[PDB]
Design a protein around this ligand. Sequence first.
Ligand SMILES: [Ca+2]
Length: 174
Amino acid sequence: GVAHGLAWSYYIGYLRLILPELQARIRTYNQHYNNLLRGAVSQRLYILLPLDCGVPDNLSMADPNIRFLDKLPQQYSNSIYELLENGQRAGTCVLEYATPLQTLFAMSQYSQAGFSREDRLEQAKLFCRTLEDILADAPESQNNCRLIAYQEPFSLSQEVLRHLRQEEKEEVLE
Ligand SMILES: [Ca+2]
């Protein structure tokens, strides 16, 4: 399955490289988002993994409750989103799509690949599990990346908020 190489390439070529400085980049931004308004950005990188492999070309968040707030400054392109409930801010995080799913989607439309929609879903799930396994075995790169994988029959904003609130619960325990 292609998912093994996709997961390793994404980790080795992207996640391994941004994650070390991410906590410092967010902590530095929180030295301003605190005094300006009163929120705080979560410290983990949240990666959206829609198992139907639907990734918007412009990489934006369609959900009106996932609202672009700011670009995160350098220490490349990482966006901070506000998660809304009833039009009010309920959380703030760095959020982006797992771009290797775009490759899986394109393979499923490339008939010479012999790669069906059923094959695509299996590889998307295997990509999630492989990347989760890599991240769990990783050093500092590990502890600050969370995969949000989902299948649709659903509120994406509520699913991200579930993860953010669980991150806070774990924070206040030791
Ligand atoms: Ca505590």
